[PDB]
């Protein structure tokens with residue numbers, strides 16, 4: 694980084710959130726095989742680099758195939774965009790329930 | 801008096817946080833504080849998702865949207881039904897990709 698970097702505020706961050714959801718999928722889904730689906734190696738790379746806060750530092754290797762079968766609803770061994778949206782929606786519902794129930798919880 | 805900023809090493813995680821916090825920025829204004837009524841839903845759409853609104857901004861347009869999103873027919877949009885809405889938008893955006 695030897696030149697200035699310029700940044701602009703976002704008027705509608707929820708719209709940019711949607712753009713990031715779409716682009717992150719294709720960042721990995723186009724690495725091998727079908728360019729519009731995620732295979733196990735691409736999904737594992739996505740979660741590890743893009744969603745580490747949700748992985749609980751678990752790297753056993755057996756764990757991923759359980760999630761992959763969960764996400765693979767049409768059972769074609771890959772995750773398409775619609776199944777990826779079900780996944781993200783599910784993560785977001787979990788975060789929302791943590792927020793909504795927080796004042797009632799204790800460690 | 802200090803202001804603080806951070807870079808976002810994992811922007812997909814922040815996008816998820818924006819999805820959650822945007823919901824609650826509008827759902828607590830009226831009535832049930834964890835669901836969007838028609839008024840709250842209209843405000844969220846116009847302010848947070850203006851690129852997906854369209855010229856159709858009549859009250860019949862928002863009432864049809866409310867009806868398409870309110871799956872359990874309680875005249876509110878809860879967080880799950882809001883997620884279905886957002887996934888539909890994502891899937892549209894992806895088609896044009």
Ligand SMILES: *CC(=O)N1C[C@@H](c2ccccc2)C[C@@H]1C(=O)Nc1cccc2ccccc12
Nearest residue numbers: 740744747748756759760763780782783784787
């Ligand atoms: C939305 C949801 O239920 N889940 C998201 C998933 C996740 C794991 C790591 C990083 C980001 C998201 C965990 C969870 C899930 O889908 N669990 C699923 C259902 C039951 C059992 C089970 C067992 C082992 C692996 C996954 C699994």
Ligand SMILES: [Ca+2]
Nearest residue numbers: 722725727730
């Ligand atoms: Ca692929």
Ligand SMILES: [Ca+2]
Nearest residue numbers: 765769771772
């Ligand atoms: Ca699949």
Ligand SMILES: [Ca+2]
Nearest residue numbers: 827830832835
């Ligand atoms: Ca409300």
Ligand SMILES: [Ca+2]
Nearest residue numbers: 870876877878
């Ligand atoms: Ca409802």
